[PDB]
PDB file of C-alpha atoms and ligand atoms in Angstrom:
ATOM      1  CA  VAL D   1      -0.002  -0.018   0.019  1.00 11.43           C
ATOM      2  CA  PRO D   2       1.406   3.386  -1.028  1.00  7.14           C
ATOM      3  CA  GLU D   3       2.277   5.642   1.989  1.00  5.38           C
ATOM      4  CA  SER D   4      -0.095   8.470   0.800  1.00  4.36           C
ATOM      5  CA  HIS D   5      -2.913   5.917   0.861  1.00  4.77           C
ATOM      6  CA  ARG D   6      -2.216   4.713   4.453  1.00  2.55           C
ATOM      7  CA  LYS D   7      -3.511   7.840   6.112  1.00  3.03           C
ATOM      8  CA  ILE D   8      -6.688   7.701   4.035  1.00  7.45           C
ATOM      9  CA  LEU D   9      -7.338   4.000   4.597  1.00  9.07           C
ATOM     10  CA  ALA D  10      -6.903   4.626   8.316  1.00  9.96           C
ATOM     11  CA  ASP D  11      -9.987   6.865   8.063  1.00  9.24           C
ATOM     12  CA  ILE D  12     -12.053   4.315   6.102  1.00  7.08           C
ATOM     13  CA  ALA D  13     -14.762   2.432   8.103  1.00  9.43           C
ATOM     14  CA  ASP D  14     -13.640  -0.820   9.630  1.00 12.56           C
ATOM     15  CA  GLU D  15     -16.544  -2.806   8.224  1.00 10.34           C
ATOM     16  CA  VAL D  16     -15.627  -1.711   4.667  1.00 10.51           C
ATOM     17  CA  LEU D  17     -12.036  -2.744   5.131  1.00 12.37           C
ATOM     18  CA  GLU D  18     -12.914  -6.026   7.034  1.00 13.84           C
ATOM     19  CA  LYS D  19     -15.347  -7.299   4.401  1.00 14.32           C
ATOM     20  CA  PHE D  20     -13.499  -6.056   1.260  1.00 11.97           C
ATOM     21  CA  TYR D  21     -12.785  -8.915  -1.154  1.00 16.40           C
ATOM     22  CA  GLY D  22      -9.604  -8.961  -3.330  1.00 15.45           C
ATOM     23  CA  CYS D  23      -6.636  -6.789  -3.915  1.00 15.94           C
ATOM     24  CA  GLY D  24      -7.023  -3.028  -4.105  1.00 17.13           C
ATOM     25  CA  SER D  25      -7.413  -1.408  -7.490  1.00 15.95           C
ATOM     26  CA  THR D  26      -4.050   0.356  -8.306  1.00 13.99           C
ATOM     27  CA  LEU D  27      -4.447   4.022  -8.974  1.00 11.59           C
ATOM     28  CA  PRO D  28      -2.642   6.542 -11.264  1.00 13.71           C
ATOM     29  CA  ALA D  29      -0.548   9.190  -9.512  1.00 12.94           C
ATOM     30  CA  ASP D  30      -2.631  10.826  -6.693  1.00 14.69           C
ATOM     31  CA  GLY D  31      -2.340  14.362  -7.981  1.00 14.00           C
ATOM     32  CA  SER D  32      -3.641  13.323 -11.422  1.00 15.19           C
ATOM     33  CA  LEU D  33      -6.910  12.223  -9.841  1.00 16.64           C
ATOM     34  CA  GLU D  34      -7.965  15.713  -8.788  1.00 11.66           C
ATOM     35  CA  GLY D  35     -11.489  16.520 -10.133  1.00  9.82           C
ATOM     36  CA  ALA D  36     -11.626  13.278 -12.203  1.00 11.31           C
ATOM     37  CA  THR D  37     -14.619  10.947 -12.469  1.00 14.88           C
ATOM     38  CA  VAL D  38     -13.330   7.338 -11.547  1.00 15.28           C
ATOM     39  CA  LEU D  39     -15.280   4.093 -12.020  1.00 18.72           C
ATOM     40  CA  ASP D  40     -14.176   0.931 -10.126  1.00 22.57           C
ATOM     41  CA  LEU D  41     -15.382  -2.281 -11.740  1.00 23.03           C
ATOM     42  CA  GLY D  42     -16.020  -4.886  -9.044  1.00 21.83           C
ATOM     43  CA  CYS D  43     -16.011  -2.419  -6.241  1.00 21.72           C
ATOM     44  CA  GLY D  44     -16.936  -4.930  -3.484  1.00 19.18           C
ATOM     45  CA  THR D  45     -17.614  -3.045  -0.157  1.00 18.72           C
ATOM     46  CA  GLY D  46     -16.035   0.074  -1.628  1.00 18.86           C
ATOM     47  CA  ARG D  47     -12.525   0.277  -0.161  1.00 16.74           C
ATOM     48  CA  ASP D  48     -11.063   1.681  -3.390  1.00 17.42           C
ATOM     49  CA  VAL D  49     -14.050   3.853  -4.206  1.00 14.99           C
ATOM     50  CA  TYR D  50     -13.682   5.503  -0.771  1.00 15.63           C
ATOM     51  CA  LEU D  51      -9.880   5.853  -1.226  1.00 15.31           C
ATOM     52  CA  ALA D  52     -10.511   7.458  -4.599  1.00 13.68           C
ATOM     53  CA  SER D  53     -13.316   9.650  -3.069  1.00 11.19           C
ATOM     54  CA  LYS D  54     -10.712  11.574  -1.014  1.00  9.68           C
ATOM     55  CA  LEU D  55      -8.180  11.700  -3.846  1.00  9.60           C
ATOM     56  CA  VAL D  56     -10.454  13.130  -6.525  1.00 11.50           C
ATOM     57  CA  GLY D  57     -11.744  15.692  -3.998  1.00 12.89           C
ATOM     58  CA  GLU D  58     -15.027  17.566  -3.935  1.00 13.65           C
ATOM     59  CA  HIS D  59     -15.081  18.356  -7.634  1.00 12.55           C
ATOM     60  CA  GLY D  60     -14.407  14.702  -8.615  1.00  9.68           C
ATOM     61  CA  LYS D  61     -16.852  11.734  -8.592  1.00 11.12           C
ATOM     62  CA  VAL D  62     -16.390   8.057  -7.884  1.00 11.92           C
ATOM     63  CA  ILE D  63     -18.669   5.302  -9.048  1.00 13.84           C
ATOM     64  CA  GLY D  64     -18.449   1.629  -7.851  1.00 13.72           C
ATOM     65  CA  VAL D  65     -20.167  -1.222  -9.750  1.00 16.24           C
ATOM     66  CA  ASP D  66     -20.674  -4.825  -8.478  1.00 15.94           C
ATOM     67  CA  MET D  67     -23.201  -7.665  -8.622  1.00 16.12           C
ATOM     68  CA  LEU D  68     -22.506  -8.926  -5.099  1.00 18.21           C
ATOM     69  CA  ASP D  69     -25.592  -7.831  -3.188  1.00 16.71           C
ATOM     70  CA  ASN D  70     -24.162  -8.094   0.282  1.00 15.13           C
ATOM     71  CA  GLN D  71     -20.944  -6.223  -0.520  1.00 14.52           C
ATOM     72  CA  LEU D  72     -22.858  -3.383  -2.072  1.00 14.09           C
ATOM     73  CA  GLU D  73     -25.119  -3.223   0.937  1.00 15.88           C
ATOM     74  CA  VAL D  74     -22.004  -2.554   3.059  1.00 17.23           C
ATOM     75  CA  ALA D  75     -20.687  -0.018   0.560  1.00 16.96           C
ATOM     76  CA  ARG D  76     -23.946   1.936   0.490  1.00 19.93           C
ATOM     77  CA  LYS D  77     -24.167   2.036   4.311  1.00 17.61           C
ATOM     78  CA  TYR D  78     -21.053   4.246   4.500  1.00 16.99           C
ATOM     79  CA  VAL D  79     -21.808   6.980   1.967  1.00 16.45           C
ATOM     80  CA  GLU D  80     -22.525   9.598   4.688  1.00 16.32           C
ATOM     81  CA  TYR D  81     -19.746   8.346   7.001  1.00 11.93           C
ATOM     82  CA  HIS D  82     -17.033   8.992   4.428  1.00  7.42           C
ATOM     83  CA  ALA D  83     -18.637  12.324   3.218  1.00  4.58           C
ATOM     84  CA  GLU D  84     -18.309  13.489   6.936  1.00  8.92           C
ATOM     85  CA  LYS D  85     -14.763  12.102   7.224  1.00  6.37           C
ATOM     86  CA  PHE D  86     -13.433  13.587   4.011  1.00  5.60           C
ATOM     87  CA  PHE D  87     -15.569  16.689   3.259  1.00  6.57           C
ATOM     88  CA  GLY D  88     -16.988  17.833   6.686  1.00  9.11           C
ATOM     89  CA  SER D  89     -20.682  17.031   6.075  1.00  9.36           C
ATOM     90  CA  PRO D  90     -22.860  13.923   5.569  1.00  7.96           C
ATOM     91  CA  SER D  91     -24.572  15.581   2.592  1.00  8.07           C
ATOM     92  CA  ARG D  92     -21.330  16.128   0.658  1.00  6.58           C
ATOM     93  CA  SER D  93     -20.643  12.632  -0.826  1.00 10.37           C
ATOM     94  CA  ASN D  94     -18.989  12.391  -4.246  1.00 14.01           C
ATOM     95  CA  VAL D  95     -19.580   8.626  -4.537  1.00 13.17           C
ATOM     96  CA  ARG D  96     -22.303   6.260  -5.743  1.00 14.15           C
ATOM     97  CA  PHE D  97     -22.639   2.517  -5.957  1.00 14.54           C
ATOM     98  CA  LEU D  98     -24.476   0.676  -8.807  1.00 17.29           C
ATOM     99  CA  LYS D  99     -25.665  -2.932  -9.048  1.00 15.40           C
ATOM    100  CA  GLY D 100     -24.937  -4.639 -12.369  1.00 14.76           C
ATOM    101  CA  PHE D 101     -22.743  -6.948 -14.423  1.00 14.50           C
ATOM    102  CA  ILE D 102     -19.590  -5.128 -15.540  1.00 13.66           C
ATOM    103  CA  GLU D 103     -20.224  -6.490 -19.054  1.00 11.92           C
ATOM    104  CA  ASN D 104     -23.265  -4.148 -19.262  1.00 11.60           C
ATOM    105  CA  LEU D 105     -22.824  -0.890 -17.428  1.00  9.09           C
ATOM    106  CA  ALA D 106     -25.744   0.710 -19.338  1.00  8.73           C
ATOM    107  CA  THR D 107     -28.234  -1.539 -17.504  1.00  6.91           C
ATOM    108  CA  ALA D 108     -26.877  -0.942 -13.941  1.00  4.83           C
ATOM    109  CA  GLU D 109     -29.214   0.093 -11.094  1.00  2.93           C
ATOM    110  CA  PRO D 110     -30.456   2.605 -10.009  1.00  3.62           C
ATOM    111  CA  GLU D 111     -28.752   4.327 -13.009  1.00  4.74           C
ATOM    112  CA  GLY D 112     -26.554   3.229 -15.922  1.00  5.52           C
ATOM    113  CA  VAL D 113     -23.167   4.643 -16.793  1.00  6.87           C
ATOM    114  CA  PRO D 114     -23.606   7.189 -19.638  1.00  3.01           C
ATOM    115  CA  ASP D 115     -21.447   7.296 -22.785  1.00  3.94           C
ATOM    116  CA  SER D 116     -18.262   9.309 -22.527  1.00  3.54           C
ATOM    117  CA  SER D 117     -18.662  10.191 -18.821  1.00  4.63           C
ATOM    118  CA  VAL D 118     -15.656   8.663 -17.040  1.00  4.27           C
ATOM    119  CA  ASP D 119     -12.026   9.802 -16.887  1.00  5.05           C
ATOM    120  CA  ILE D 120     -10.463   6.647 -15.334  1.00  4.27           C
ATOM    121  CA  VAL D 121     -11.767   3.126 -15.215  1.00  2.00           C
ATOM    122  CA  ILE D 122      -9.966   0.997 -12.591  1.00  2.00           C
ATOM    123  CA  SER D 123     -10.215  -2.729 -11.743  1.00  4.37           C
ATOM    124  CA  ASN D 124      -8.206  -5.575 -10.226  1.00  3.07           C
ATOM    125  CA  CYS D 125      -8.450  -9.185 -11.482  1.00  2.12           C
ATOM    126  CA  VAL D 126     -11.943  -8.869 -12.950  1.00  2.00           C
ATOM    127  CA  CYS D 127     -11.309  -9.903 -16.505  1.00  2.00           C
ATOM    128  CA  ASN D 128     -10.625 -13.625 -16.196  1.00  2.00           C
ATOM    129  CA  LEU D 129     -13.945 -14.259 -14.465  1.00  2.14           C
ATOM    130  CA  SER D 130     -15.851 -12.206 -17.041  1.00  2.00           C
ATOM    131  CA  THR D 131     -18.400 -14.116 -19.063  1.00  3.23           C
ATOM    132  CA  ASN D 132     -17.520 -12.053 -22.155  1.00  2.00           C
ATOM    133  CA  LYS D 133     -14.145 -10.121 -22.301  1.00  2.29           C
ATOM    134  CA  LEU D 134     -14.876  -8.341 -25.663  1.00  2.00           C
ATOM    135  CA  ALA D 135     -18.261  -7.061 -24.314  1.00  2.00           C
ATOM    136  CA  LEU D 136     -16.455  -5.826 -21.173  1.00  2.69           C
ATOM    137  CA  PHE D 137     -13.760  -3.972 -23.069  1.00  3.14           C
ATOM    138  CA  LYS D 138     -16.363  -2.459 -25.427  1.00  2.00           C
ATOM    139  CA  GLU D 139     -18.304  -1.197 -22.459  1.00  4.54           C
ATOM    140  CA  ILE D 140     -15.221   0.364 -20.913  1.00  4.43           C
ATOM    141  CA  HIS D 141     -14.437   2.113 -24.244  1.00  3.68           C
ATOM    142  CA  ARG D 142     -18.047   3.357 -24.335  1.00  4.90           C
ATOM    143  CA  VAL D 143     -18.148   4.936 -20.880  1.00  4.14           C
ATOM    144  CA  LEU D 144     -14.678   6.607 -21.170  1.00  2.00           C
ATOM    145  CA  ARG D 145     -14.497  10.172 -22.405  1.00  2.00           C
ATOM    146  CA  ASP D 146     -11.878  11.127 -25.055  1.00  3.01           C
ATOM    147  CA  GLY D 147      -8.564  11.353 -23.222  1.00  2.08           C
ATOM    148  CA  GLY D 148      -9.847   8.990 -20.419  1.00  3.77           C
ATOM    149  CA  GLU D 149      -7.953   5.716 -19.587  1.00  3.63           C
ATOM    150  CA  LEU D 150      -8.581   2.189 -18.417  1.00  2.00           C
ATOM    151  CA  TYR D 151      -5.868   1.737 -15.743  1.00  2.00           C
ATOM    152  CA  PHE D 152      -6.082  -1.812 -14.495  1.00  2.00           C
ATOM    153  CA  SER D 153      -4.249  -4.867 -13.166  1.00  3.51           C
ATOM    154  CA  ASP D 154      -4.895  -8.436 -14.217  1.00  6.36           C
ATOM    155  CA  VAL D 155      -3.395 -11.890 -14.840  1.00  5.32           C
ATOM    156  CA  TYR D 156      -2.089 -12.738 -18.292  1.00  6.46           C
ATOM    157  CA  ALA D 157      -0.135 -15.732 -19.790  1.00  4.92           C
ATOM    158  CA  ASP D 158       2.954 -16.048 -21.990  1.00  9.99           C
ATOM    159  CA  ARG D 159       1.146 -18.645 -24.101  1.00  9.25           C
ATOM    160  CA  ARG D 160      -2.311 -19.986 -24.970  1.00  9.03           C
ATOM    161  CA  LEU D 161      -3.780 -22.265 -22.245  1.00 12.62           C
ATOM    162  CA  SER D 162      -5.054 -25.655 -23.210  1.00 13.61           C
ATOM    163  CA  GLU D 163      -8.756 -26.539 -23.194  1.00 15.17           C
ATOM    164  CA  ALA D 164      -8.176 -28.730 -20.129  1.00 13.11           C
ATOM    165  CA  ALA D 165      -6.652 -25.787 -18.281  1.00 11.46           C
ATOM    166  CA  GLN D 166      -9.483 -23.537 -19.384  1.00  9.91           C
ATOM    167  CA  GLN D 167     -12.072 -25.979 -17.973  1.00  6.66           C
ATOM    168  CA  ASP D 168     -10.437 -26.528 -14.572  1.00  6.16           C
ATOM    169  CA  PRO D 169     -12.557 -24.927 -11.729  1.00  8.93           C
ATOM    170  CA  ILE D 170      -9.700 -24.248  -9.271  1.00  3.96           C
ATOM    171  CA  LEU D 171      -7.605 -22.502 -12.047  1.00  5.25           C
ATOM    172  CA  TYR D 172     -10.765 -20.642 -13.111  1.00  7.99           C
ATOM    173  CA  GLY D 173     -11.460 -19.368  -9.516  1.00  7.45           C
ATOM    174  CA  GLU D 174      -7.827 -18.328  -9.111  1.00 14.05           C
ATOM    175  CA  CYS D 175      -8.110 -16.065 -12.218  1.00 13.26           C
ATOM    176  CA  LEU D 176      -5.578 -18.261 -14.063  1.00 11.45           C
ATOM    177  CA  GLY D 177      -7.815 -20.461 -16.134  1.00  9.28           C
ATOM    178  CA  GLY D 178      -9.461 -17.530 -18.002  1.00  9.49           C
ATOM    179  CA  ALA D 179      -6.133 -15.712 -18.536  1.00  4.27           C
ATOM    180  CA  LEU D 180      -5.402 -14.601 -22.076  1.00  9.52           C
ATOM    181  CA  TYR D 181      -2.119 -14.939 -23.889  1.00 12.02           C
ATOM    182  CA  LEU D 182      -0.662 -11.439 -23.964  1.00 12.44           C
ATOM    183  CA  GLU D 183      -0.865 -11.146 -27.776  1.00 13.18           C
ATOM    184  CA  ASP D 184      -4.507 -12.303 -27.749  1.00 13.62           C
ATOM    185  CA  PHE D 185      -5.244  -9.677 -25.130  1.00 15.19           C
ATOM    186  CA  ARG D 186      -3.642  -6.996 -27.304  1.00 19.48           C
ATOM    187  CA  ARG D 187      -5.798  -8.004 -30.329  1.00 21.78           C
ATOM    188  CA  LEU D 188      -8.939  -8.210 -28.217  1.00 22.11           C
ATOM    189  CA  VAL D 189      -8.594  -4.731 -26.744  1.00 22.81           C
ATOM    190  CA  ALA D 190      -7.723  -3.310 -30.069  1.00 20.26           C
ATOM    191  CA  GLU D 191     -11.010  -4.769 -31.463  1.00 21.05           C
ATOM    192  CA  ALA D 192     -12.700  -2.875 -28.586  1.00 20.29           C
ATOM    193  CA  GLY D 193     -11.144   0.448 -29.689  1.00 24.70           C
ATOM    194  CA  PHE D 194      -7.909   0.579 -27.568  1.00 22.92           C
ATOM    195  CA  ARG D 195      -5.183   1.107 -30.009  1.00 24.29           C
ATOM    196  CA  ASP D 196      -2.169   1.564 -27.750  1.00 23.72           C
ATOM    197  CA  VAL D 197      -1.467  -0.601 -24.615  1.00 26.49           C
ATOM    198  CA  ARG D 198       1.034   0.824 -22.172  1.00 24.38           C
ATOM    199  CA  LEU D 199       2.814  -1.337 -19.648  1.00 26.24           C
ATOM    200  CA  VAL D 200       2.937   0.256 -16.139  1.00 30.53           C
ATOM    201  CA  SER D 201       4.285  -2.605 -14.022  1.00 31.10           C
ATOM    202  CA  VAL D 202       4.574  -6.396 -14.064  1.00 28.39           C
ATOM    203  CA  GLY D 203       5.130  -9.124 -11.508  1.00 28.44           C
ATOM    204  CA  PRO D 204       5.308 -12.888 -11.810  1.00 26.21           C
ATOM    205  CA  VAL D 205       2.442 -15.172 -10.705  1.00 26.03           C
ATOM    206  CA  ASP D 206       3.404 -18.567  -9.530  1.00 29.23           C
ATOM    207  CA  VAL D 207       1.503 -21.862  -9.815  1.00 30.39           C
ATOM    208  CA  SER D 208       3.409 -24.205  -7.568  1.00 31.43           C
ATOM    209  CA  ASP D 209       0.622 -26.816  -6.812  1.00 29.22           C
ATOM    210  CA  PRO D 210       1.823 -29.863  -8.771  1.00 31.66           C
ATOM    211  CA  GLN D 211      -1.623 -31.078  -9.898  1.00 31.19           C
ATOM    212  CA  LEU D 212      -2.724 -27.652 -11.216  1.00 31.09           C
ATOM    213  CA  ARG D 213       0.772 -27.111 -12.701  1.00 30.81           C
ATOM    214  CA  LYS D 214       0.341 -30.247 -14.858  1.00 29.51           C
ATOM    215  CA  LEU D 215      -2.563 -28.430 -16.640  1.00 26.86           C
ATOM    216  CA  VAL D 216      -0.284 -25.455 -17.417  1.00 23.85           C
ATOM    217  CA  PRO D 217       3.197 -27.085 -17.430  1.00 22.03           C
ATOM    218  CA  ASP D 218       5.457 -24.461 -18.951  1.00 25.71           C
ATOM    219  CA  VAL D 219       3.112 -21.467 -18.803  1.00 25.00           C
ATOM    220  CA  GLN D 220       4.459 -18.347 -17.273  1.00 27.48           C
ATOM    221  CA  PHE D 221       1.701 -16.164 -15.686  1.00 28.27           C
ATOM    222  CA  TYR D 222       2.196 -12.438 -14.982  1.00 30.13           C
ATOM    223  CA  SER D 223       0.313  -9.824 -13.066  1.00 30.28           C
ATOM    224  CA  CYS D 224       0.330  -6.772 -15.367  1.00 29.13           C
ATOM    225  CA  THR D 225      -0.878  -3.206 -14.828  1.00 28.08           C
ATOM    226  CA  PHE D 226      -1.660  -1.613 -18.159  1.00 27.17           C
ATOM    227  CA  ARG D 227      -3.080   1.734 -19.057  1.00 23.00           C
ATOM    228  CA  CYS D 228      -5.124   1.930 -22.275  1.00 21.60           C
ATOM    229  CA  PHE D 229      -6.106   5.506 -23.305  1.00 22.56           C
ATOM    230  CA  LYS D 230      -9.157   6.308 -25.386  1.00 16.78           C
ATOM    231  CA  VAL D 231      -7.737   8.861 -27.752  1.00 17.08           C
ATOM    232  CA  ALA D 232      -9.176   9.323 -31.267  1.00 15.44           C
ATOM    233  CA  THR D 233      -5.973  10.295 -32.907  1.00 12.48           C
ATOM    234  CA  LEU D 234      -3.869   7.271 -31.808  1.00 12.12           C
ATOM    235  CA  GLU D 235      -2.230   5.019 -34.485  1.00  9.58           C
ATOM    236  CA  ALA D 236      -1.382   1.370 -34.267  1.00  4.52           C
ATOM    237  CA  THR D 237       2.298   2.351 -34.544  1.00  6.71           C
ATOM    238  CA  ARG D 238       4.591   4.714 -32.598  1.00  7.65           C
ATOM    239  CA  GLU D 239       5.629   7.416 -35.046  1.00 10.35           C
ATOM    240  CA  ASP D 240       8.145  10.250 -34.631  1.00  9.72           C
ATOM    241  CA  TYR D 241       6.914  13.720 -35.427  1.00 11.24           C
ATOM    242  CA  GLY D 242       9.888  15.440 -33.755  1.00 11.71           C
ATOM    243  CA  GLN D 243       8.027  16.282 -30.550  1.00  9.73           C
ATOM    244  CA  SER D 244       9.114  16.808 -26.927  1.00 12.48           C
ATOM    245  CA  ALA D 245       7.012  16.767 -23.811  1.00 15.06           C
ATOM    246  CA  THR D 246       7.960  18.470 -20.577  1.00 17.08           C
ATOM    247  CA  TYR D 247       6.337  17.737 -17.195  1.00 18.33           C
ATOM    248  CA  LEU D 248       5.630  21.052 -15.498  1.00 19.37           C
ATOM    249  CA  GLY D 249       5.551  19.733 -11.917  1.00 16.51           C
ATOM    250  CA  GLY D 250       2.695  19.830  -9.477  1.00 13.67           C
ATOM    251  CA  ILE D 251       1.891  16.183  -9.096  1.00 11.64           C
ATOM    252  CA  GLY D 252       5.266  14.782  -7.907  1.00 14.14           C
ATOM    253  CA  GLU D 253       8.944  15.214  -8.562  1.00 14.05           C
ATOM    254  CA  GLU D 254       8.540  13.237 -11.757  1.00 12.75           C
ATOM    255  CA  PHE D 255       5.794  11.781 -13.829  1.00 15.41           C
ATOM    256  CA  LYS D 256       6.033   8.191 -14.906  1.00 17.24           C
ATOM    257  CA  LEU D 257       3.656   7.484 -17.768  1.00 20.66           C
ATOM    258  CA  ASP D 258       4.758   3.837 -18.370  1.00 21.72           C
ATOM    259  CA  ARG D 259       7.785   1.630 -18.335  1.00 17.37           C
ATOM    260  CA  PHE D 260       9.239   3.547 -21.362  1.00 20.15           C
ATOM    261  CA  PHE D 261       8.460   7.165 -20.514  1.00 21.13           C
ATOM    262  CA  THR D 262       9.588   8.981 -17.358  1.00 22.29           C
ATOM    263  CA  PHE D 263       9.293  12.775 -17.321  1.00 23.95           C
ATOM    264  CA  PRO D 264      11.487  14.654 -14.805  1.00 20.96           C
ATOM    265  CA  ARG D 265      10.145  18.041 -13.680  1.00 19.74           C
ATOM    266  CA  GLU D 266      10.927  20.788 -16.214  1.00 20.37           C
ATOM    267  CA  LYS D 267      13.159  18.667 -18.485  1.00 17.94           C
ATOM    268  CA  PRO D 268      12.126  17.923 -22.154  1.00 18.40           C
ATOM    269  CA  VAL D 269      11.758  14.318 -23.163  1.00 17.19           C
ATOM    270  CA  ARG D 270      11.377  13.252 -26.748  1.00 16.70           C
ATOM    271  CA  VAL D 271       8.129  11.486 -27.483  1.00 14.82           C
ATOM    272  CA  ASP D 272       6.318   9.613 -30.304  1.00 15.19           C
ATOM    273  CA  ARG D 273       3.119  11.178 -31.568  1.00 14.38           C
ATOM    274  CA  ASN D 274       0.860   8.644 -29.735  1.00 14.09           C
ATOM    275  CA  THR D 275       2.450   9.648 -26.415  1.00 13.63           C
ATOM    276  CA  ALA D 276       2.103  13.295 -27.342  1.00 17.10           C
ATOM    277  CA  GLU D 277      -1.554  12.821 -28.168  1.00 20.56           C
ATOM    278  CA  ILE D 278      -2.161  10.890 -24.879  1.00 21.61           C
ATOM    279  CA  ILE D 279      -0.641  13.848 -22.894  1.00 22.20           C
ATOM    280  CA  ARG D 280      -2.464  16.487 -24.922  1.00 24.16           C
ATOM    281  CA  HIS D 281      -6.019  14.931 -24.929  1.00 22.90           C
ATOM    282  CA  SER D 282      -6.039  13.339 -21.460  1.00 24.22           C
ATOM    283  CA  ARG D 283      -6.253  15.062 -18.142  1.00 25.67           C
ATOM    284  CA  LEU D 284      -2.410  15.031 -18.023  1.00 25.22           C
ATOM    285  CA  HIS D 285      -2.300  18.160 -20.335  1.00 26.09           C
ATOM    286  CA  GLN D 286      -2.759  20.151 -17.116  1.00 22.80           C
ATOM    287  CA  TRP D 287       0.752  19.325 -16.039  1.00 22.07           C
ATOM    288  CA  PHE D 288       2.539  19.156 -19.376  1.00 24.37           C
ATOM    289  CA  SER D 289       3.876  21.280 -22.269  1.00 24.23           C
ATOM    290  CA  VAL D 290       3.923  19.315 -25.554  1.00 26.00           C
ATOM    291  CA  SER D 291       5.687  20.706 -28.599  1.00 25.63           C
ATOM    292  CA  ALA D 292       4.151  21.092 -32.079  1.00 26.20           C
ATOM    293  CA  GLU D 293       4.282  18.253 -34.661  1.00 26.68           C
ATOM    294  CA  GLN D 294       7.015  18.566 -37.214  1.00 28.87           C
ATOM    295  CA  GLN D 295       7.361  16.503 -40.415  1.00 31.43           C
ATOM    296  CA  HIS D 296       7.085  12.747 -39.972  1.00 30.27           C
ATOM    297  CA  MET D 297      10.525  11.348 -39.298  1.00 31.63           C
ATOM    298  CA  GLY D 298       9.702   7.577 -39.379  1.00 30.21           C
ATOM    299  CA  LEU D 299       9.457   5.203 -36.513  1.00 33.74           C
ATOM    300  CA  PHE D 300      10.176   6.665 -33.055  1.00 32.36           C
ATOM    301  CA  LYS D 301      13.690   5.785 -31.948  1.00 28.75           C
ATOM    302  CA  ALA D 302      14.643   8.496 -29.457  1.00 30.56           C
ATOM    303  CA  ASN D 303      14.334   6.296 -26.339  1.00 31.98           C
ATOM    304  CA  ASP D 304      16.894   4.078 -24.687  1.00 33.51           C
ATOM    305  CA  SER D 305      14.532   1.045 -25.119  1.00 31.58           C
ATOM    306  CA  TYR D 306      13.045   1.928 -28.489  1.00 31.04           C
ATOM    307  CA  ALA D 307      13.459  -1.669 -29.849  1.00 29.45           C
ATOM    308  CA  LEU D 308      11.276  -3.006 -26.942  1.00 31.47           C
ATOM    309  CA  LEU D 309       8.961  -0.065 -27.289  1.00 32.57           C
ATOM    310  CA  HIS D 310       7.924  -1.389 -30.759  1.00 34.83           C
ATOM    311  CA  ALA D 311       8.130  -5.144 -29.773  1.00 32.69           C
ATOM    312  CA  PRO D 312       5.273  -7.449 -29.138  1.00 27.74           C
ATOM    313  CA  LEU D 313       3.613  -7.033 -25.702  1.00 27.64           C
ATOM    314  CA  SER D 314       4.931 -10.469 -24.535  1.00 28.41           C
ATOM    315  CA  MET D 315       8.496  -9.378 -25.160  1.00 27.47           C
ATOM    316  CA  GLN D 316       7.994  -6.116 -23.216  1.00 27.12           C
ATOM    317  CA  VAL D 317       6.472  -8.035 -20.267  1.00 27.69           C
ATOM    318  CA  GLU D 318       8.999 -10.869 -20.132  1.00 24.06           C
ATOM    319  CA  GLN D 319      11.971  -8.466 -20.328  1.00 23.36           C
ATOM    320  CA  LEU D 320      10.632  -5.905 -17.833  1.00 24.71           C
ATOM    321  CA  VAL D 321       9.502  -8.403 -15.175  1.00 22.65           C
ATOM    322  CA  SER D 322      13.165  -8.513 -14.075  1.00 20.11           C
ATOM    323  CA  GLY D 323      16.701  -9.188 -15.394  1.00 20.04           C
TER     324      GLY D 323
HETATM  325 CA1   CA B 401     -12.210  -4.876  -6.621  1.00 20.61          CA
END
């Protein structure tokens, strides 16, 4: 748990923390959340929704969605509690909880999530239990505004799992059985409208149980945090238009966009046009200066890892996990 989050979580209601299921949804840099609308898919008792409530502040909004009746009951019980805690009055909540399948946010109760209404969609380990991944990614694309991002952690494989592995109930329940091969994931989210997948962090996921392991013998599983921006002008490729971007400060000493792009305060960093357009059209434009496009110069190479930058997603992940 990040240090900045500890103080906030210490103010969240015991019952919310005690009954919260799963790992916390990882969040973009705290300062970048100010005034944003955040949607947590699979919100449970609302631990992450309440954490985000404080971070987005009074001008931001947070929405949680879940289909677990009894978790949502807990979440809804504490709307006033956390409005008092964070904003000085029980009437000043910026959160709401909706009941629905994450594969159809338009039919959630008591209200659906509108088109183009959300800045950041967050989630942890929800995909591999989804009954329809493509439908889910399409829904996420629909609710995001232009410049918004899906910033999420899930489990992926370095190869395609066998049918036997995909049918196993213990692997299923562990979020392993439903894991996609990283290249299949890339193609699926591209079909949904997400043209550029950025790797934020990656850790290994072990399957040591010998019985289960026999179903996935040489598979390497990874926990990956990706950010996928909805930006109309993105291309499938990372092209050089001679641009630089400079982080202006205000939301940390540096801004780390992904494993390839770190922006020190007030220093220019050369960027490909997709990265430029992400900064310009997303909420990040508030803290950045991005130079004008020049003539196309070909593929972007002005990065100390440019070869990996253009490599398949499996190569980025395997090489960045460690060593
Ligand atoms: Ca969750």
